[PDB]
Amino acid sequence: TQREMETRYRVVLDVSRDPMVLVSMSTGRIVDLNSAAGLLLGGVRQDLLGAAIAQEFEGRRRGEFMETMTNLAATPVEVLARRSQKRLLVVPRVFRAAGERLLLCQIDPAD
Amino acid sequence: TQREMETRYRVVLDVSRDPMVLVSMSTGRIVDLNSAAGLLLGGVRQDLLGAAIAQEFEGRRRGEFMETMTNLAATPVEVLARRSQKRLLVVPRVFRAAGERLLLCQIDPAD
């Protein structure tokens, strides 16, 4: 049933056409995402897992970027993805999972 | 970490704007869904959990409906939701979770 929840998560995340990136609050790094998000970011899953999310967006740095997100998730950010050169909108939500916080980020084309 | 996977699943499913319904292969009943799916079906979560999915669609019966889905998921169905009176398209995918099969169904407006 541990195996079942992981599987249900994996399937729901990968099938959903809603572009989503999962970010560690602790490290500002991507822990998971779906291919719809990969497509808007312009990167494959393998290159984006473990990546610092702020560094995918031109002009952004981890400190400022994570504070911006955390602040918004308390109430969209306008960004430009380096790999795809697409202008995007990012809407963050914060949730607690096993003593740890994650940012689930929804991504939408801005233009 | 069992608690973490459930939470990650719950969040990813509820946040995703992609309308999804989770159906038990064993009983043909809904085990989970998001509010986007609820909206197209025309029902609240509380009334749809545990419901036989075929009975939400005018003219469909569980036997035939589940076989149709299972068959398609091997390679969209056109349905009419009773509560919302909306014409929909349903695209099923099958996956194994803890000795059991689930149909993840994606729902889209047909008209």
Cα separation, B108 vs B111, in Å, equals 9
Residues of B in contact with A35 (CB under 8 A): none
Look-up: residue for tokens 């749809």? B48
Structural domain boundaries, residue B78: 1-111
Measured between alpha carbons, how far is A82 from A86 in angstroms, rounded to an integer? 8
Token duo for residue A70: 């955390």
| Cβ <8 Å between B18 and A22 | no
Strand partners, A93: A104
Dist. CA A92–CA B15, nearest whole Å: 11
User: Residue B100, Cα to own-chain centre: how many angstroms?
Assistant: 16
Report the 10 Å Cβ neighbour count for B108: 13
Residue B2's contacts (CB-CB under 8 Å, 6 or more residues apart) are A1, A2, A5
A61 touches chain B (CB under 8 A): no
**A 91-110 near B (Cβ less than 8 A):** 93, 95-98, 100, 102, 104, 106
Among the listed residues B106, B20, B9, the one whose alpha carbon sits nearest the alpha carbon of residue A10: B9
Q: Tell me whether residues A1 and B104 touch, CB distance under 8 A.
A: no
Answer for the pair B98, A4: CB distance below 8 angstroms, yes or no: yes
Could you give the CA distance from residue B96 to residue A11 in angstroms, rounded to a whole number?
10
Number of domains in chain B: 1
State the CATH number of the domain containing residue B7. 3.30.450.20
Angle formed by the axes of helices A2-15 and B2-15, nearest 10°: 20
Distance CA B56, CA B84 (A): 10
The answer to whether the beta carbons of residues A89 and A108 sit under 8 Å apart is yes
DSSP letter, residue A9: H
Rounded (5°) CA angle B15-B19-B24: 100
Residue A108 to residue B104: CA distance in whole angstroms: 24
Tell me whether residues A2 and B2 touch, CB distance under 8 A: yes
Q: Are the C-beta atoms of A57 and A79 separated by less than 8 Å?
A: yes
Experimentally determined by: X-ray
The beta strand positions in chain B, using DSSP E, are 20-24, 30-33, 77-80, 87-96, 101-109
Which resolution in angstroms does this entry have?
2.5
> Closest residue of A to B6, CA-based?
A5
Cβ–Cβ < 8 Å for B1, A6: no
Q: Which of A13, A95, A24 is nearest to B13 (CA)?
A: A13
Q: Where are the alpha helices (DSSP H) in B16-78?
A: 35-41, 45-48, 62-72
CA distance B44 to B48: 6
